Write a structure and sequence with these properties.
2 copies of one chain form a homodimer. With about 270 residues, chain A is α+β, with helices and mostly antiparallel strands. Chain A contains 9 helices and 14 strands. Bound molecules: 2'-(L-isoleucyl)amino-2'-deoxyadenosine (2 copies). It is classed as lyase.
């Protein structure tokens, strides 16, 4: 049974040289899968799995190609994502496929994505990103250890006001200088949570309130975080009121698909199934 | 690593009542996955797994819908195929998805195919089909026991002149009246193999010649059939000359993609990945 996500495109604002030599002038986005496009107003940072190994996937700019060279000339965009998600994107028309030459002979056509190279999540910690809707001009890639490489793209945007997981993981960074030292996390990469949604019995900073209610102490308390995640998801969909954006004042249930449609129209997001 | 197939659409020429009550006036195709679109000239019958359980999938006539009713009004076509392949088709835009109502609540969107019902392969034995390119006006569904429900659509068209598997399975039908009796196979459903490809050291009926060379005695001789299959595939791609069609006289390697493009343009075939 597949699930529908919104893939959010976070533009790399300054491409580091270790990527620039491989992507050669192309726009590069880190792409994240979310069920909650309506929370983009509250993004504070991006999350990656430090030991996750990600692809640099050639993508269509805002039919299966016969030649690598033609695909390389026609596509000026790269998506950083798990290879797994890249194939799903390719089936869905989001990135090109080519008739691969890497095995067998010409008697069979073997469709393959075009991956320029690999990157470890750790190498991206600290990269500045332009993200949609958030008031921050730049947000930064930080480590999260609970990320599954088997889900979405393996890259996750952070809205700590309204995700218990994001709140716990960011608090882990804020309170452990041995964590910040290990990955050289600068202070200026750690941005304050933003009030974006009112939950009429809880206030405007609901993820923090629920982490306390469930007595969650770290981003590893999986069973507890699972209950918190599920409660905040249902409660906010049916009762949460947006206090930001075009649909400020409206319930999430009434605004969510309009927000999502706008992100898609504006080129910040895509529909993604897996 | 995905493979590229051509899905061949075989139109049901007379829809039996047990299907007609479910599909209600819609065109119905049995859809088959093949690597060899150039052999459509030699189709003699269609194969199904008697105990395979197939879906009746609503399909686009020659974006995810919110309502079942709208999808039902907009789609006048049904594809018989495995559910597994139907999902792959849906990801690739070949059949519609809807936002399902079958579980959970409105706070999540769960894309689902629209399956009108199930059919067992056995119930379809004897159904007359209009198939592309073959000189036969109608060909008929027959049982093949080696079919994998995990591959393609679980439905396979038959070209016994140039598929060792098809030759063995049809010969099993021709020589076992206990097989024909069990499934009530009429004589007039068993059509003669057609000469379609010359292999310059082998002649015009190469699959039969190879089954003898490998001493294959039934459609179950999997290891032997695997070697035969692989030899005929490579040999015919590089050395086989078509004696039928627009590209008669040309080598398969030079004609195959033009034949395939034509089937697609004419609405007889689609590109399918899995
Ligand atoms: C306020 C929500 C904020 C932006 C929140 N941060 C969010 O977008 N969460 C993602 C998604 O909505 C949720 C349920 O599918 O899992 C997260 N997710 C997506 N890919 C993931 C992965 N690879 N590993 C762990 N969680 C993942
Ligand atoms: C002359 C070729 C004639 C039409 C030949 N009959 C052909 O089209 N063969 C299919 C395909 O080309 C081959 C390799 O993928 O497996 C058959 N195939 C496809 N789906 C299958 C399934 N579910 N189970 C077993 N074999 C399958």
């Amino acid at each position: 049974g597949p699930q529908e996500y919104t893939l959010i495109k976070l533009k790399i604002h300054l491409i580091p040289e270790f990527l620039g030599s491989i992507v050669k002038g192309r726009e590069v986005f880190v792409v994240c899968a979310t069920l909650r496009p309506e929370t983009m107003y509250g993004q504070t940072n991006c999350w990656i799995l430090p030991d996750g190994e990600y692809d640099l996937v050639l993508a269509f700019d805002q039919k299966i190609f016969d030649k690598y060279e033609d695909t390389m000339k026609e596509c000026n965009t790269v998506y950083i994502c798990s290879e797994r998600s890249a194939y799903n994107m390719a089936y869905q028309g989001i990135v090109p496929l080519i008739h691969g030459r890497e095995q067998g002979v010409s008697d069979k056509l073997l469709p393959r994505i075009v991956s320029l190279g690999k990157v470890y999540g750790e190498q991206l910690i600290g990269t500045p990103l332009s993200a949609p809707m958030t008031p921050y001009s730049l947000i930064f890639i930080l480590p999260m250890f609970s990320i599954s490489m088997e889900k979405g793209t393996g890259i996750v945007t952070s809205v700590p006001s309204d995700s218990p997981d994001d709140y716990a993981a960011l608090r882990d960074i804020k309170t452990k200088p041995l964590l910040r030292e290990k990955y050289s996390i600068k202070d200026e990469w750690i941005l304050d949570p933003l009030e974006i949604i009112e939950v009429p019995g809880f206030g405007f900073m609901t993820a923090e309130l629920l982490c306390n209610q469930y007595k969650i102490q770290s981003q590893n308390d999986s069973a507890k975080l699972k209950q918190a995640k599920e409660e905040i998801y249902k409660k906010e969909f049916y009762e949460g009121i947006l206090i930001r954006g075009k649909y400020s004042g409206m319930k999430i249930c009434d605004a969510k698909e309009l927000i999502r449609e706008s992100l898609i129209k504006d080129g910040y997001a895509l529909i993604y199934l897996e």
